[PDB]
């Protein structure tokens, strides 16, 4: 069986998982996950010595792949100077300069400890600057949060005509939750930005994943919107830990007056990464490769007679079992009208893929990087063809609908 074959290939990982289990709550994955000891480029090696073609390590932070050389040279150069904390360090200033240069909306910024502290600070800046108490967000302490469903234009027009004057900010992630697992349309963000401005709310755009991945000026430049604050991290921090909140002067003015300057090691990675993304036309390449992978996956599913869809944008895709591969409108996903995929089936898919020497993320998500080539996508497609046959061998595929 897939499960037993997976246990035999990964006994080294089962060993460390037991040690983990005595110190860490419990569990994403069902049997046990993979313990990695090495990675370079698009490949990673587990404790058993098995090598895998990787489509997801870093959750998008590694736009340039594992351990790019210029990133590593910059990090070692910085470490040899021995400043790990920094009061104020030239590198941190040079990094901020690239950010302000990429995002026309960002005139001033403050560096933070991560993506999560970024969107939490943003919410406090928004509050303080407006005087207001409510935050609007999307679905999937709380008496201060308004929820709106993605793509519900008219339910949003309502929220603002009903609580509008008490909304500090509308915060949204473009493309959708987890870079589009749950899609949201651009035109809904563009509407939310206009509505925020018209009711005196700020618009916060969370470009933690979009930043330096979808384009050299962010998603905001693609959407042709000018958010009041932008949250960045991941690729905009060169893969290393840390976050950035940037924005207009007025709003950003609330900070550092009434109502952390940066880690030099992360700063050196970022400067190296941002420069190599811009120089090597990385965004354009991985947006091409993502389109290619989406089409190739959809052709695969049609050919094999399966009602599964590969969807998403830019340098990614996500899988939805239960929809025909020629689906163009993902409205059924954004509204949660598709059946949840069987969790056993997903787990077997993930183990099967690993048995073939391939690894993807979550419930069938991929992120492509600069060091992926067409050949790696073709390998993914080939390996999926076999994984889908093993799933059907164990009766884990439902060909119906709902």
Summarize the structure in words.
Keywords: Aminotransferase, Pyridoxal phosphate, Transferase. Its cofactor is pyridoxal 5'-phosphate. InterPro entries: Aminotrans_3, Aminotrans_3_PPA_site, PyrdxlP-dep_Trfase, PyrdxlP-dep_Trfase_major, PyrdxlP-dep_Trfase_small. The chain is globular. It starts with a helix and ends in a 9-residue tail after the last helix. The strands form 3 sheets. The protein has a 7-stranded mixed sheet, sandwiched between helices. The chain is built from 15 helices and 15 strands. A hairpin with a 2-residue loop joins strand 1 and strand 2. The protein folds into 2 domains: about 190 residues, Aspartate Aminotransferase, domain 1 (Alpha-Beta Complex); about 210 residues, Type I PLP-dependent aspartate aminotransferase-like (Major domain) (Aspartate Aminotransferase, domain 2, 3-Layer(aba) Sandwich), CATH 3.40.640.10.
SSE layout and pairings?
Elements: H1 2-9, H2 11-21, E1 36-40, E2 43-46, E3 51-54, H3 69-79, H4 90-102, E4 108-112, H5 115-130, E5 134-138, E6 145-148, H6 153-163, E7 167-172, H7 177-180, E8 182-183, H8 186-198, E9 202-206, H9 218-223, E10 229-233, E11 243-247, H10 249-252, H11 264-279, H12 282-303, E12 308-311, E13 316-321, H13 331-334, H14 343-355, E14 358-359, E15 365-367, H15 374-393
Parallel strand pairs: 3-14, 5-6, 5-7, 7-9, 9-10
Antiparallel strand pairs: 1-2, 2-3, 4-11, 10-11, 12-13, 13-15
Helix pairs in contact: 1-14, 3-11, 4-11, 6-8, 12-15, 14-15
PDB class: transferase
Keywords: aminotransferase, Structural Genomics, nppsfa, National Project on Protein Structural and Functional Analyses, RIKEN Structural Genomics/Proteomics Initiative, rsgi, transferase
Assembly: monomeric
